[PDB]
Amino acid sequence: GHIVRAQRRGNGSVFQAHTHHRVGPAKFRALDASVISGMVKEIIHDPGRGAPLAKLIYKGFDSALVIAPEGIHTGQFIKCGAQADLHIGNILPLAQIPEGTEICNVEHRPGDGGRYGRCSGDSCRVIGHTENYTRIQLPSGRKALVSNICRATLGIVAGGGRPEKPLLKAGNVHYKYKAKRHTWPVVCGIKMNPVDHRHGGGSHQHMGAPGTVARSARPGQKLGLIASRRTGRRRGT
Amino acid sequence: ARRTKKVGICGKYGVRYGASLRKTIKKIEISQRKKYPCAFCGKDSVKRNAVGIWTCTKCGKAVAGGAYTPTTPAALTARAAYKRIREAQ
Amino acid sequence: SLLQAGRFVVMLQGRHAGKKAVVLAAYGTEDRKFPYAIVMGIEKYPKKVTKDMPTEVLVKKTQVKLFVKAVNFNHVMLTRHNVKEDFFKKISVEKVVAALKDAPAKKALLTEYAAVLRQKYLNNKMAWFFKPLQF
Amino acid sequence: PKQVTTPKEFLALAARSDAKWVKVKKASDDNTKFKLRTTKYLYTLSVKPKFVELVQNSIPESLEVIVL
Amino acid sequence: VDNRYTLRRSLGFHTIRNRVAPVRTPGNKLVAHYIAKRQNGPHCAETGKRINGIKCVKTCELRRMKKNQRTVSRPYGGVYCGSVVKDRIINAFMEEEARAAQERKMANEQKKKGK
RNA sequence: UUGUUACGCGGAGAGCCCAACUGUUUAAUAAAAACGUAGUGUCGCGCUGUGGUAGUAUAGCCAGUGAACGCGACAUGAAUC
RNA sequence: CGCGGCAACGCAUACUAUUUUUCUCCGCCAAUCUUAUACCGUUGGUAGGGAUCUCUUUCCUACAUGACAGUACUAAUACCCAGGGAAACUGGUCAUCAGGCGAACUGCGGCGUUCUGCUGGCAAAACAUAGCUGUUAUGUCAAUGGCUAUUGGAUUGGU
Numbered sequence: 001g002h003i004v005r006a007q008r009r010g011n012g013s014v015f016q017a018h019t020h021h022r023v024g025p026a027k028f029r030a031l032d033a034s035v036i037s038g039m040v041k042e043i044i045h046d047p048g049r050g051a052p053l054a055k056l057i058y059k060g061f062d063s064a065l066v067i068a069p070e071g072i073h074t075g076q077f078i079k080c081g082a083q084a085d086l087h088i089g090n091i092l093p094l095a096q097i098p099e100g101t102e103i104c105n106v107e108h109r110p111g112d113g114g115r116y117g118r119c120s121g122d123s124c125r126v127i128g129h130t131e132n133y134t135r136i137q138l139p140s141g142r143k144a145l146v147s148n149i150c151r152a153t154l155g156i157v158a159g160g161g162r163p164e165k166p167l168l169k170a171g172n173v174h175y176k177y178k179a180k181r182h183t184w185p186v187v188c189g190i191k192m193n194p195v196d197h198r199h200g201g202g203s204h205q206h207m208g209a210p211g212t213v214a215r216s217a218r219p220g221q222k223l224g225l226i227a228s229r230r231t232g233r234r235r236g237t
Numbered sequence: 238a239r240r241t242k243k244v245g246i247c248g249k250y251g252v253r254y255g256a257s258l259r260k261t262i263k264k265i266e267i268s269q270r271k272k273y274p275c276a277f278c279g280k281d282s283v284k285r286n287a288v289g290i291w292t293c294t295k296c297g298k299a300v301a302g303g304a305y306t307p308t309t310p311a312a313l314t315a316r317a318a319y320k321r322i323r324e325a326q
Numbered sequence: 327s328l329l330q331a332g333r334f335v336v337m338l339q340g341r342h343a344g345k346k347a348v349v350l351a352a353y354g355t356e357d358r359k360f361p362y363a364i365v366m367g368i369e370k371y372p373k374k375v376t377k378d379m380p381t382e383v384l385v386k387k388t389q390v391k392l393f394v395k396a397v398n399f400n401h402v403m404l405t406r407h408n409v410k411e412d413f414f415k416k417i418s419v420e421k422v423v424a425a426l427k428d429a430p431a432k433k434a435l436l437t438e439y440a441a442v443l444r445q446k447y448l449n450n451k452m453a454w455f456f457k458p459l460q461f
Numbered sequence: 462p463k464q465v466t467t468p469k470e471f472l473a474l475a476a477r478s479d480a481k482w483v484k485v486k487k488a489s490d491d492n493t494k495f496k497l498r499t500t501k502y503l504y505t506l507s508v509k510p511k512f513v514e515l516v517q518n519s520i521p522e523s524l525e526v527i528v529l
Numbered sequence: 530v531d532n533r534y535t536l537r538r539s540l541g542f543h544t545i546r547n548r549v550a551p552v553r554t555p556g557n558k559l560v561a562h563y564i565a566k567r568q569n570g571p572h573c574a575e576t577g578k579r580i581n582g583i584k585c586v587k588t589c590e591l592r593r594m595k596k597n598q599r600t601v602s603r604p605y606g607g608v609y610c611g612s613v614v615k616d617r618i619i620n621a622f623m624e625e626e627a628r629a630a631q632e633r634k635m636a637n638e639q640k641k642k643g644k
Numbered sequence: 645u646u647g648u649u650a651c652g653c654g655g656a657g658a659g660c661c662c663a664a665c666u667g668u669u670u671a672a673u674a675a676a677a678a679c680g681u682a683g684u685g686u687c688g689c690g691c692u693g694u695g696g697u698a699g700u701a702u703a704g705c706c707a708g709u710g711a712a713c714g715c716g717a718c719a720u721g722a723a724u725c
Numbered sequence: 726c727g728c729g730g731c732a733a734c735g736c737a738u739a740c741u742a743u744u745u746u747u748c749u750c751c752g753c754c755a756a757u758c759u760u761a762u763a764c765c766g767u768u769g770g771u772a773g774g775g776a777u778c779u780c781u782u783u784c785c786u787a788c789a790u791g792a793c794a795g796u797a798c799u800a801a802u803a804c805c806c807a808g809g810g811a812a813a814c815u816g817g818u819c820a821u822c823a824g825g826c827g828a829a830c831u832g833c834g835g836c837g838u839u840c841u842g843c844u845g846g847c848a849a850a851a852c853a854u855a856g857c858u859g860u861u862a863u864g865u866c867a868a869u870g871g872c873u874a875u876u877g878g879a880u881u882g883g884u
Contacts, residue, residue, distance in 0.1 A: 070301050119713060156311055403622065
């Protein structure tokens with residue numbers, strides 16, 4: 001057999017991110033001990049990422065490409081800190097914020113940059129305050145103990161509802177993955193011959209083998225549904 | 238004269254792509270081109286610049302909105318949530 | 327009503343924009359058909375001075391340069407502050423001639439009233455006026 | 462190559478100790494052009510036949526004069 | 530007649546730097562003359578508009594020109610146009626005046642306790 | 645009675661099958677019904693992680709200038725029923 | 726050895742450093758207007774050559790000015806300033822439109838980019854006729870359109 005397209009993404013020659021026109025890494029300023037006001041100089045769109053970024057100035061002018069909540073405008077004053085009040089814009093630690101509210105770009109570790117809840121039209125919800133660890137629900141469903149000192153932007157991330165509209169033409173998806181990375185178009189494994197992929201070969205196109213494989217299964221062998229505790233139509237539940 | 242009976246903005250696509258998809262995009266393509274009322278300078282000339290971004294021309298300003306309308310319903314709910322908690326206490 | 331003589335202003339646009347001023351004669355004329363008021367002002371402010379190197383470096387930073395101009399009401403920003411006697415009247419007694427023309431005639435005023443207005447900085451009065459503002 | 466209007470200003474440019482030659486040259490409409498050479502530029506002077514005779518005399522004696 | 534003309538420079542291709550225009554010589558011969566590049570010249574920060582009172586030439590040959598024609602006379606002469614400078618005066622006055630009146634306020638308010 | 649004079653310029657219609665469509669393909673016997681696609685669906689994983697790669701230096705490389713409206717793994721193949 | 730204009734801005738002014746901003750400087754597609762070059766044109770003309778049984782005041786060639794530097798008023802569109810203070814809504818594009826966050830409109834406003842004319846470069850050169858044995862003669866003129874194209878630029882729109 002040959003090495004399979006799933007294995008070949010590691011070696012990373014043509015399968016690298018197209019990172020040329022990307023404006024910078026989206027994160028907070030570092031922590032550095034109250035309250036600090038910060039004007040939104042402008043809000044710009046970087047390629048690949050569906051969200052906007054908003055370039056702040058903590059005037060020297062110290063810059064920070066923070067990811068943009070919805071309802072931010074140019075020449076708003078954003079207020080990072082503990083004793084900053086509640087507006088959509090402001091960047092509070094999880095000690096201060098009320099529970100049962102939608103927050104954006106929340107950090108895992110303090111002073112980190114921002115980790116959970118970054119893509120367009122997403123938000124971490126806050127469940128409740130234990131003592132040190134403010135428990136929050138992530139967009140998927142999963143729940144996470146996160147320390148109260150670490151920061152999070154208030155409100156929902158901008159650019160919501162982009163997949164509501166379908167892309168009618170193959171050309172629209174060509175321009176989508178030009179900004180991101182080469183991973184498209186996908187040739188299906190059944191169509192390929194036996195050497196190229198596991199599902200390939202045979203007189204008539206069909207999978208033949210069970211098509212559902214363990215965590216223990218090797219490189220080359222992990223193809224199709226990996227460790228699928230259910231399959232088929234998820235009716236109810 | 239009106240010249241298409243049914244189709245509207247999706248007449249550019251012609252016979253392609255199915256009836257159900259052109260109904261769906263008819264709603265969204267009308268939205269993203271439409272000029273919307275500005276908060277700041279007041280005037281009705283807020284166009285879409287990029288995906289999330291909505292530049293007003295005459296202001297010279299921008300706002301972060303939705304993808305295809307400047308107001309997302311879910312983001313508009315978040316204002317009302319932080320209003321009632323700030324107005325309390 | 328607001329534009330009296332005894333009032334400070336700030337210049338909004340022009341060459342001297344930002345810089346301080348006081349009104350003299352708030353007036354239509356046939357020369358120029360709009361509202362206009364003849365003003366004093368100051369071009370270069372006296373900077374702060376440590377007492378190391380006496381006399382020579384002081385008498386530079388001492389000296390305060392002036393200007394006079396016949397400015398529109400739109401291009402001046404009015405202020406809280408007023409002047410508080412005969413001295414205010416003396417500086418504005420003669421000024422239209424300098425404004426009208428002849429550089430030597432106008433330079434006779436600005437050399438004179440530089441020396442008069444500087445002696446008020448000696449006393450630490452009009453402390454707002456001789457101080458600048460940062461943009 | 463600049464032109465110079467006034468005959469007085471021409472004679473200021475002539476007496477600089479830059480200039481190597483002047484060239485006299487007949488022209489259309491019975492005019493003539495005095496082309497002063499300088500290191501940088503070539504200063505031309507158009508004149509009418511009223512004041513043609515006086516200007517040549519006006520020119521410095523030392524500077525060489527090439528007739529065409 | 531044949532009015533066709535060669536490129537003189539040894540670059541073949543039609544880039545932005547290698548562009549030509551046909552011109553009649555003194556000798557009745559058509560010939561390539563090369564186009565010098567366009568310049569936008571100084572726009573302003575804030576809004577993004579053309580300032581007046583300066584040519585759009587190259588900034589290198591802006592140095593060769595007189596110091597007069599490089600600038601506008603006011604404070605923030607090149608960078609900011611007129612009405613944006615007016616706004617900076619009004620705000621930076623009244624930000625400082627409110628802060629100065631705050632020092633007058635906290636002087637005046639605390640004196641009520643003594644009397 | 646001939647005339648878009650030469651030159652240049654669609655024969656048309658009525659059934660049935662396959663793939664929806666623009667596109668890609670066995671350089672040198674196969675251009676297709678094959679591949680592709682939008683659309684639909686299933687599975688894995690909240691970063692001390694997941695899918696790779698790399699090789700003795702406790703090397704650091706790819707997705708990642710990334711964070712579930714996301715990244716990766718498959719299957720079906722526009723719409724309508 | 727710092728002055729003019731109410732203002733937009735104009736005119737003769739240094740250097741080191743720090744920070745901030747601009748020019749360099751940016752996709753593709755579509756439309757309108759306009760220099761330059763080419764070409765076709767209405768009006769004439771003069772130089773030479775071709776053609777002729779008959780006809781053709783004919784046919785052909787020629788009618789041109791570089792980088793660079795200057796300052797006139799004509800006349801444009803962009804943007805800004807002063808006055809002005811708008812529904813009986815007015816102004817404007819090929820098209821969308823613009824305006825009390827200040828429109829129409831008036832200034833022999835300001836300024837940028839293009840434009841027409843007049844020069845310098847500049848006829849001394851170059852080219853075409855005519856004659857003399859290398860050079861002397863005349864001449865290269867006057868009027869004014871493009872519904873044609875390409876190029877540079879301007880004013881915009883769409884995606």
